[model samples]
Target chain A: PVDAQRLDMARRRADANAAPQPGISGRAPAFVHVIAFDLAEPARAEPAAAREGAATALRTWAEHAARLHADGPEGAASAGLLPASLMVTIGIGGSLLEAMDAADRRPDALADLPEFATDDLRPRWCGGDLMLQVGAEDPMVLAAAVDELVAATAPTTTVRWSLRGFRRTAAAAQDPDATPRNLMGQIDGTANPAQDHPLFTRTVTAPPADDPAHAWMDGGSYLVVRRIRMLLDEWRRLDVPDRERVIGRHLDTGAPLGGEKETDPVVLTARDADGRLVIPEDAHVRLANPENNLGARMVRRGYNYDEGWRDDGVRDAGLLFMAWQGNPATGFVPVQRSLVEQGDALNRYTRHEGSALFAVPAATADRYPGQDLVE
Target chain B: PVDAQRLDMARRRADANAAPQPGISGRAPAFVHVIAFDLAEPARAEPAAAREGAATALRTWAEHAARLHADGPEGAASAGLLPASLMVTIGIGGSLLEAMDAADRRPDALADLPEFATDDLRPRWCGGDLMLQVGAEDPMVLAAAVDELVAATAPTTTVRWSLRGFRRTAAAAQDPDATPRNLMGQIDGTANPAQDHPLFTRTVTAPPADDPAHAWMDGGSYLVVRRIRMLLDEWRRLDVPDRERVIGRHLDTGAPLGGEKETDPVVLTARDADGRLVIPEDAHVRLANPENNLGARMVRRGYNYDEGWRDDGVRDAGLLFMAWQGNPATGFVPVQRSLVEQGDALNRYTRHEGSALFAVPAATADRYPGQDLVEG
Candidate 1:
C-alpha cells in the first residue's frame, strides 16, 4: 500500500502542470484549478489490488447528470465539454451521469460551442446533439458513440469529444474487442487504473474521522470546469494517419495491447512481435501510466460542440471535459498531459481559448446550499 | 525732472509685472512686448522730440518691418492673438509705421493679409476687429480717438490700448507744450523743434546713460504689440446712444470739446454747453492726464484682423495691436487704470491677448546687423 507521502507526491506532479507559462500583460491572464470527489450511496470501500472481487475489478460509476450540464455554459472554460442540453452521457454509468445531471437545468446555457476549455482539448458545447462516452464499456453503446461522433464532428467545423481514463489500477480491466477503439482497433485506457485510491475519505470524498453520517458525502462529487476553444481549420489540414497517430489510439478496434478482445488486460510489461517499443514512446499509453506513474486515475465525463465558421464557420466549439478523482494532480494532470500531447485527434483541430480550474469541495449533510463550498 | 527715487518706483512697478503671479497656474496666459528705439543720426542735435524725425522714425520702422515679417506670424499667437493675421501697433511715428510695414510685407512672407494698421476702427470686419490705439498726443487726438473707437469696436469683445512715449533725456530741450497743449490740443509741440535740423547727428539723439546700445538697437524707436480679439456679434447688439457716449468725440467732425476738427486745440479745462462734464468726467480726456495720473505719452500704431473660425465655427480673429513708450508705469499702467472703470466702449469689442514693454537702446555704431535684441 502506498503511504500518504507517495499519494501526495502524485497529486503534486499533476497540479504542477495546472499553470502554463505566463503570457502578455494588459491582455487577460489565465488561472487553473482541479477538483475531485466521491459518487456512491454511502460510498463503498474496495480492497487493495492484492485482494480484488469481481472479474475486471468491477469499477463502479455514479451519474448526477446535472453536473455535466453545468460544466459547459456553467463551468470554467477548460473541460471542453458541450453545454448540457438533452445530453446522452455514455461514460461508465457513474462517471458520466452525475456531471450531466448537475449541468442540465439551462436550455440555452451552452451557446458558445467551438471555444475549447482552457487546455482539455475536447467538446464542452452541446449544440443540437450531445454524447459523452468512456471507451467501449458496452458493445451497442460503443458503436453508437463512434458512429455519431464521426457524423457530427466534421473534419474542420466540429469539436471532438474528450476521454479521461488511461492505464487502469492493479485490479485493471477493459473491453479489448471494443470496435470504437483507436484507429488501429485497439482498446485505450488498458494501461492505467486506480493503482491505489488515495484516502478519498480524507481530503476529498469525506473525512471519515469528522463525520458519523457520511450520507451526503457519498455521491457528492467535486467538479473542475474549463471552457476550451478548438481550431477546426488546423485539424482539417492534417493527413489521416498523422491524425490517427496524434490521437495515439488505434483507428479500428478499441482493444489495447496484449489483449485479444475488448475486455482484456494491457500488457504494459511486455512488447509486441517486433519488439521495437510495442506502444510508441509518445503514445497516449506511455504518458498516462497509472502503475508506472504512482497509480493515479480519474473518471472522465464530457461532451462535444460545433460552431461553424468560414463557409463552415465553426468559430467556437470544443470539449466541456471533466473528471472526478481522489486527487487532481495524480488523476487529472497526468492524463491531461497525454491528451495535450498526443491522445486526442481533436488537438489538430482546436486551440485552448479560456482556461481556469475550480476546486469544488465535497457536499455537506444539511448545511445550506453553498455553505460548505464557500468556506 | 523726476528724481531717482521716482524712477526706482517706476522700475519696481515694471519689474513686478514681469514676475509671474502667484496662482495663475492653469489659466490661459498672455504676453506682450513693447520695444522702444530712437532714430537720431549723430550729425544733428535736434531736441528730443524733433530728434526722432519722421525719416529716422521711417528708417527705424524699416528694421521693425524686417524683423516682423520674419518672426511676427508665430510670435503673435504666444501673446493670445489667435488667428491674428493683423497687428494693431499703437504709439505713433516709428511705433505706428513699423507695424504698417510689417502688415504690408505679411502677404509677401505668409501669402495672406495678417493685419491692417490704422487708428480708424470703422474700416470694417464689422467691429470684430482688435484695435490698438496710442493715446500719447494732443487731448483732441485722444478725444477724437474715443469717437472713432466707439463706432469701430464690437460691443461684446474687449479692448486694451496703452499710453506710451518717446524716451527723452534731461539734456535735450524737450517739447514743454507737448504735454499741456496736447491735453489742451492747441499746437502742443509748436515750440519744440530744438533737435530737428541736420538729422544725421547721433550724439544729440543718444539715449540717457542708463540705456546702453547693443546690436539690434539701430535707432531708438519703440515697439508695443498687443493681441486682442474683437467680438462683433456682441457689439452690434448694443444700443446706439450708448455707442455714441463711448465714442467721446464728434461723429462727423472728429472734434474735441471746444474744438472744431480732429486737429483743433484740446480744451483741457473747458466745459460744454450744459457744463455737466461735457466731455464726461471719465472720458478718455479726463483719465489719460498727468494731473489725473501723470501718465507718459507715446506713439500708437496698430492693425486689425478677422481670424476666421474652425468648423465648429467660432472666429478668433482680433488685433495684433501694439504701441511704444519710454515708461510702463507712467505711460501704460496709469492709462490702463484710468479706463479700467470707465466702461470705454473699446472694452466691449476686444480682448487683450498680450502686453509687454522693452527698452530699445541707441544702436551701436560699430555693429552692422542688429542681433543683440534677441541675444540678451
Candidate 2:
C-alpha cells in the first residue's frame, strides 16, 4: 500500500541480487531489449473462451499502453544506447506495432519527428530507428533471426533494447555474484519476484489468442520497452568531480555512494562541511535518484554491450535494462524526475526515441485476451 | 531601393496596410525589437568560419551549470506559458548578443533544455528565460521605453531580439509601409538603405556580421525583434476560411504578407473540388509568405518566457523566434519544410507567434545608436 519503507527495502534487495553479467545472444551486442507486454485478460484453459476474451478489453489494456510508454526508455537506456530523437518499433501482429502506429497517427503524439509512420523507413533515417519483432519458439532460430534483423537496421549508432521473448525468460541469463552492492557492490533482489513468482498472476497476466479485444493482442505477456540512448560524448566530458556526483554510485561498483543498503540514509559525498554541494547541481546521480524523498525506483535487469570488432572499431554496445512493476507513476516518475533535476546529462546526447506499453492477462483466468470488461 | 512593384499593380500605392484593431496598449502590446553591433573582423565569413564562429559564440553563452531547470508540471505548464526553445538575434555589434549567444551554442550545447538560437521566429512557445537589452544613444531609449517592463524579475514572453540602436528616426517611422515594423501597426524606416543598389550597404552588408576582420560591415543597419505572443486563440481559431488564410496580408489593399514589397510573390490561395486544400503545396500566394522561392527569404527574432500565475496554470508563453539571411537556404531549411510537408492540421492551429527581423552590421563596421549605417 505505497509503503515507502517497504519499497526502499525492496529496492536495496533487488539491487543487491542484481549481478552484472553477459546476457543471452551474448557478446552484449550493442542492442538487447527487454520489452514488457500486457495481455487483455488471462489465458483461458478452454481455447474458445480465450478466443472470445479479446473483445472489450480497453479498461484492462489502457494501463498496459501507459506502462509500456513509461518503461520503454529506461529499459533501453540501461542497455547502453544513446537515445536519439528517433526510435523505431518493429513487431508483427499487435505487440509493439500498435503503440508505434497510434503515436504516428495521433497528432498529439507527433513528438520529435516531423513525420512518423510504419510503411516507410526512409525519412526516419534522420532519427535512428529500432525495430521490435516477435521471436521464434526455438532459441537458435530466435537468435540467428533477430541478429540478422538487427544487423540490417541499425539506428544512428546507439545501443538498443528490442523484445526477445518466446521460451527464454530475462532473469535466467545473469550469473550469481558473491558480493552484495549496497554501497559496496553488494548483492540485492533477495526478496523480489522473477516472472514465475506466486503473485505473478495477481500483478501480471498473459491471456490467450482470439476474440474482438484480443484481435490485435493475444498470447503475449505484458511488454514495456523504451529505446533511451545516452550521450556518451557528453557523459564523458563531465569532470571527474561531476561524474561522481551524477550517478550517486561508486565508479567501480554499482553501490550508492557514501554508504550501503536501501534503508541506510543516503550519503552524499560531494556535500561540503556546510552542506553545500561539492558536486555540481547537475550531477546525474543527484538528479536520477536524489537523496530527496521525491525520487522513484524500478526493478532493473540489463547486460552491457561492447560491440568492438576485434578490438579495433567499437560499434554500438550498451545495456539492455529491464524491469517489472505494479504502478508506473509511483514507480518510475520520481526516478526520472530526479534524473532531470540532476541535469540529465544523458539527455543532451540521448533522446527518448521509442516507447510502448501492453497488458497481458493471467493465464489461469477463464477470460481470454479481452474478457476483463466483457466479464 | 525597396521595390514597390505590387503597390503599382494594386494602384493603392498610397494606401497603407492596417492590422486588426489594437489592444488596450493602443498599439500592438508587443514591441518590435532592433539590434546593432560590429564584429572584430568580417573577412573570414565562410561556412567553415561560420561553424567556428558559432562554436566560439556557444562556448561564451552556454549555461554550463544548467542555470535553468524544469519547474515541474504545475509550475511550468500552468503559467499559460509556452516557453521559448529558440532565440533569434537581430543586430550587429562586436559581440552582438544574438549571433554570439545563439548560433554558437549548438552541436555540443547544454543537454538539459530544448534550445535553438536563430535570427528567425516560428509559431512556437518559448519555454525558457531570455533577454533583449539594446545599447545605443538616448534617442534609441524611446523603443526601450515604449512599453514598461512586464515585471522586475521577468519581462514579457517569447523570443528576444535586440535592435542594437535604441531608437528609429522620425523619418524612418513615418512611412506607412517601411522596412521596419513597429507595434503601432505603421510602416516605418523610410530612410533605410537599399538591399541591391550601390546603397545596399545601408541595408545588406558586404561581408556579413560574422567576419569582424574586414570593413564590409561599416555603415550596415541591423534588425532585432522577438517572437511576441499574438493571443493565437483570437486569430488562429477564426471561423472564416478566406479571412483566416489572409490575416498575414495587408487587409484591403492586400500587400505582401508581413509588409513585403511587390518583388515578393503573393502567397495566393486555391481550392480543391471538395474545398479540402485551399493553399496548394508551396503556394506563394498563401499566408506565411505564399511565394515559393521567397518563403524562406526573410529572417526572424524571438524570446522565451515564464508567466508566473498562481495555483496551477500554463507555464509557457512569449516571442522567441528570429533569423537572418542573404538567401532562402541560408536563412530557412526544415522550418519551411515543416510548414509545407508536415501535418497541416497542427500548422493551421498556429501562425507566426512572433514576427520581425532586423538588418544589422557586417564585420569591423562602426555602429552608433539611431544613425543610419550607410547614408553617412
Candidate 3:
C-alpha cells in the first residue's frame, strides 16, 4: 500500500543537513553535560599578560577537544568514535572576570545575577568562574569529551558543579523542531527564539555593539542555568484538568487553552461560559509570558533529568532549565521576577534548587571562545 | 554485495521467538524496575485466614496486571500500549514468610542471607517482605506496570526500596544472547547458564522434592540481588592490563585470560613463559569458576544502573547484580563465600551496597507465582 521507492528517495533527500552544534537550530543531542569550574589561583592572579596566556591555553585546549576526531580511511581526521555530533561551548563567569581584574571590561550583564524570590538556591550549585557545555548524541562520546576537556584544564581550574541532562532524540521526538516535553509532561521551550526570527540575533547574543568597552562582547550571550526539581508525587496526585490549569496548555497537543494550534495566539481576553478566563490568570504561561515581561525574551533550551527515586518515595526528576539571552537584566531578570513575585500556578509543584549565571562568548574564526575578551 | 531478501527473512524468523521473561534468557529489555515491599500490619497479625486472603488478592492483582493487553481487531487481548514484552516476576522474601505466620513453611534458603565480608549493606535496601521484578522493552511500559502493581498491592504492603536499571538494547548489543557490558566496561553474565544446557533446569530451580516440607518449592529458584556499586573513578584509573588482570578477561573479547573463547576451559594448570599462572590466583574468574565452587551455578541477570552523580564527584553507577539458582546453599553461597575469603581481585573496585534473598516460585498453568505455597 506504500510507495517504497518514493519513501527511500525521501529519506535520501532528508539526509543532507548541517552538523549539530550547541546554541544552534540543528538536531538536538541525546545527552548534555554542563560542567562549570572555578579558575585556580595562578590564572586569576595579577599581570594581564600571564592571565591572557592562561586564557589562551584554555581556549586552545577546548578548540582542540572540540575538533578532535577519529581517523578517516586515508589517515585523515574524521568525525569521532560515533558520528558523535559532539559540541563544546565555553563561557566566562562573573567570578572569573573579577579575578582577572577585568570586571569593568565585561558586558553589562556580566555582574552577579540577582537572587529571585522563588530561589531556595544552594551555594554548591550556584556560581562558577567558567562553564563548558559538552554535548553529543551518544553518552559515551560526551563522557570522553568531558574527560578530555577536564584533562586539559585541570591545571587551571577545578570543577565546581556539573549537571547531566537528556532530551528526546530525533527518533523519539514527536515533531520536527517542536519543543520536547519535560518530566511533568508539559511542552517546554515552545516560545524559544528561531534562527530566522527578525529579533533572534538581538534576543540571544548582544547585537553588534557601538561602545568600545562592549565591542569585545558583541557576539557573546548571557547564560542562566537552573536545576528545577519537580515535586512529581504531589504533581501526579492532581487531576489532569488541574495539571492543565497550572501549565495553561494541553497535555497532548501543547496548544493554548481554546486554541487548536500550538503556536496559536494567547487570547488573554477569551472567556468560558462561566465568565472565567479561558487560560487561568495565574497560570505558568500567563505569568512568564513575553507580553507580561515587557517583550523580554530568552532562548530556552532545557532538558529533562531523572536521578532515581528519592528517600521520600518521590522521583528526583526535573528540568535542567537553561536560557541564553542578550542581557539578563532586560531578558531573564524581568521574566523570572514575574514568575517568582506573581502567583505562578506552577510554583507549588516545583522547587528551584540550583542557579548559575555565566557570560558565554561568541565563536571566533581562528580563536576559541572567550578569546576576544581575554586577549 | 548483500542479500537483502535473505536478511529480511532472517529478521522475520528472529521476530517469531517468544518474549524474554525475567530470570530467563532472551533479548534483554531496555529497562527494568525492581521494587520491593514490606507487608502491612493485618498480614503480620494473628489471623491466618486474613493473611492468606491478602496474599491471594496480591497474587490476583499481579496476574491480572501481567495479563493486561490491548484488544486486537478480533477483540482478543494483544500486546498493549507499547511493544511491552512485559514480564512480572514475583518473589517472596524471608521477612514476608515470617509475617505470614509461616516462617517454617519457606525453603531452607529463605532465612537471612549470610553476610559476606565485602558487604557494607544498607538496611533500607537489604530486607523486604516481597520483591517485584517488572521489566519491559520500553521504559514507559515498565513504569505503567509498576504503577498498576503498586495500586493493587498498596493496601497490603508498603514499598521498601525501588531501583531502576537498564541494559543495552539489541541494536546496541554486540550479538544476540551475548552478555551485555556493565557500567565498568566489563562483560557481565558471560558465564551464565544457557537454557538448553544439560544442567540448566537443575541449575536454575530446585530438583524434584521428596520431603513434604520441601515439596512446595520443587520448581522454585532462589534469587540473590546485590546492589554492587562500582568505584568507577578509581577503577578507571587503572591501566588496561591492570584492569584485565583484576577481571581475568579481555575487556573487548570477554575471554578468560588464558583462553581464546568466552566458554573456553579454565586451564588453571596452564602457565605463562615465566611459569606463573596465566590467570592470577586472586582473579575473579579463578574464585567464581564452577570448578572451584563445588559445581555451583547461577543464572546471572544483571543490569547497569546510573543514579546521577554523588556529592563527592563520583557517578553513582553500578550493576543491579541478580542471580537465580536452584539452591543457595549449593549454588550462590559457596561461590560467594570463596570470593569473600579467598581475596577476589575485583573486590577492590566494587562495594556491596545492598543485599537481599528471595524465594522465587516457578510459573503455573492457571495460577500466579506463590499460589502453590499459599494454597499448600
Candidate 4:
C-alpha cells in the first residue's frame, strides 16, 4: 500500500533542503503560468498600506501551499494535489513604481517596450503594474497556486492578463545539457550565458547601491516579454536547406554555417569555396550576434504555446519570449534595433503580437519576491 | 555506455506485446491533438480512389512514425524524440457520408445536432467531414504525428479545425482509477459505463448489419463533441456548499445529494425534513441523469482545455466534451433536450461554443478506422 504520510514528509524534506532560488534556480520547469495585476484604487492611493496587504497575501499563500505539499490532499475524494516542485517569483512593473512615488528607481528601459515596426501590440496583453510567475512540473499544482494567489490578492489587485506555456520535459532531451526545440523545430537559447559565470550577474542584474534612485532596486533586473507567433505553415513548407539559410544555423546541430559544433565560434569573415559569405549577410544569426552589436547580451528563457487553429485554417501558436538583463539599453535595445533595420531573415516567419516590461527584484530569505521595494 | 539498439528493441517489444486497442486504449495520455478535415473534390467525386489514397497514407504515416520511435532522432544534436505511446483514431462526419453517396445510410440524428437554447455555436468550430485524434504521453511526439498525417493527407483534404488538449499526468493523479477533475475542480465522468461492460458495447456502437438504412454504419458509433466554456470567475466566487448544491453532488466525492459513495443510486424522490427535494429541481445532475431521460446513456471521454484568458477578464477555458453512443436520438438528444428545456442549474456557469457529430467506425487489425464504410 502507498504510504501517504511517509510520502508527504519525504517530499517536503527534499524541498526544504533544496531551498530553490526563484527565477534562477532549477532551470525552467515543464509548465509555466504567468499572471499580471494592477493595484486597486485603495492600494494605489496608499502605497504603504497596499504594500503591507500585498506582502501579507503573498506570505500567507506561500505557507498555505507549503502545507498542502507537506500534508497531501485532505482526502482521496478531494482534488488530488502533488509536490510538483512549485516555485513562485514576483516582479514590480514601472507603472507600480510610478504609482508608489518611486519612479526614479526603475531599472533602465523598464518603462514600456518601445513599439517596433513589426509589432501588432494589443493593449490588454501589453503592460501591468505587477507580475506573478508560477512554475511546476505538474499543471494541476500550477493551477492550484494560481487559485490561491488570486483568492489572496483579490482585494488589492485586478488581473491584467494571464497565459500558460509549456516546453519539452527534461527526459525529452537527447543530451543532458542540450537546449530544447521550439514549436518551429529549431534548438532555442543555445547562446545563453552560464548562471554561475561572473558575466552572467553583470549582464542580468544591477549591483547593490546606496544612491536613492538605485538603492531600492539594488540586485534587481529588467524583464522584457513578447508574444512571438511563428508562421509554421510557411516554415514547414520550406525544405531543410532553405530553412537552415533563414536561421543561419544547421537544424540538426544548431551549428553556424561553416562550424561543425554548436559551441564553435561563428567565423563572420569566412567564405565558402564558391566565394559566398558562409553565414548570409542578412541571416538571423549575423544580425543578432552580440559581437556585432557592441557586446549586448541577455538571457533568453522561452516556452512553446499552441492555442488552437485560427478561422483561416492556420495555427495560432508560437513562442513566449522572456528575456532578462541588467539593463535593456545595453542589452535588448541595440540588438533589436539592428534586427529591425538590417532585416532579420527570420523575421518574415514570426510576428510580435504582445509586449510587456517589468523590473524584477532580488530574492531575500525573510520576505517574498519584490519585498525590498514594497516594504 | 547506453546501449541504443538494446533500448530500442526493449521499447518495441513492450508496445508490440501490449497490442492495445485503437481509439480507446492506453487510457488518456498527457497530450491529445485533434484535426478535423474536409474531403477534396476528387475524393468526393470518386469514393473508391479516395479510400485507396487514405488507406495508403495512413499506412505510410504509421510506419514512418514507428521508425522514428525506434531509431530516435537523425543525429545526437537533433531535436530529440520519444515513443510517447502514440495512437490514432479516425471518424467520418455526416457531410462526408453524403459526399460519398452514402447519405441514405447515415445513423439516426447523425446529420446534425438539434439546436439547444444554450448553444452559441460558431461556424468555424461546428462541423467537419472527418476527424483525426492523436494521443501521446509526450507533446513533441504528438506534434510529430500531426506533422506526418497533415503532410500525407494534404492532397486529399483540407483542415477545417484543430486543437490540442492536456490532462493531469499519471504521477499527478491521486489514484490510478480516479476520474480526473475538469478545470472547474469538480470530478468529471464519474458515472460513465465501463468500456468492458456489456452495456457499454450496446450503448456505444451500432448493431451488426441487416437493416437497409443503417447497414453501412454497422460497428460504427456516433461522436458528439461540444466546446464548453466555464464562467470560472463567477463560479469561483460561490462558497463550497453553494457550489455543491448547484451540482447536486459532493465536489470531492462526486456522490449524489443524499448518497455517500459516488456509485450510490440517486434517490430522486427523497426529500429534506422541511419537505423540499434533497436535490434541487434545477440541479445539473437531476437534469443530466439518464434515469430521468428514458434510460438514455453515453460513454463520455471528455478532456479539459485552457485557451488562456478572455478579453472580459475571465478564462476562455473549459471542457472539450466528447461523448460516444450508438445513436444520438436514443442517447444524446433526449438528455440534452431535457437539460435545455427543464432548466439545468449548471447552465448558468457554462456556454456551448462549438458542436460536431461524427460516425466513428470500429477498428480492425487489417484495416484503419472508417475503412469499412469507405470501402463498401
Candidate that scores best on lDDT: 4
Q: Residue A83 of model 2: what lDDT?
A: 16
Local accuracy of candidate 2 as per-residue lDDT tens digits, B158-262: 123222211121111222132433211212222222433443322122233343332233433323233443332333234433432433334222344434553
In what order do the candidates fall by lDDT, top score first? 4, 3, 1, 2
TM-score of chain B of 2: 0.26
- lDDT per residue for candidate 4 within B105-133, as digits (tens), equals 67665758888998888888878888877
Kindly report the root-mean-square deviation of model 1 from the true structure over all alpha carbons.
Answer: 37.0
* lDDT score at residue B32, model 1, on the 0-100 scale: 19
lDDT of 3 by residue, B1-376 (tens): 1222211211221121122224355545556888887776655675485457546655765565455432101110111222434566678787666666676576676667788878988899887878887765444344545655665665566778878877643322223245666666677776876767756666877776666765667777788889988886677678888888997887767788878887776677789898899889999988999999988888888887766456655556688988888788887789999999999988898999988888877655556666666766
> Chain A structural similarity (TM-score) per candidate?
0.41, 0.43, 0.87, 0.86
- Give me the runs in candidate 4 sitting further than 4 Å from their true place: A1-21, A40-78, A99-102, A171-178, A257-270, A371-375, B1-21, B39-79, B99-102, B255-281, B363-368, B371-376
Give the worst 10-residue stretch by lDDT in candidate 1 chain A: A21-30
Model 3 reproduced share of reference interface contacts: 0.04
Model 2 spans with C-alpha error above 4 angstroms: A1-247, A250-323, A326-371, B1-59, B62-296, B299-323, B326-349, B355-376
Per-residue CA lDDT of model 2 for A122-163, tens digit only, reads 221122222233222112222222232332222211222333
Which residue pairs clash in candidate 3? none
**Superposition TM-score, candidate 1 onto the true structure:** 0.25
Candidates ranked by DockQ, best first?
4, 3, 2, 1
Q: After best superposition, candidate 2 residue B340: deviation in angstroms?
A: 19
Please name the candidate that would achieve the greatest TM-score relative to the true structure: 4
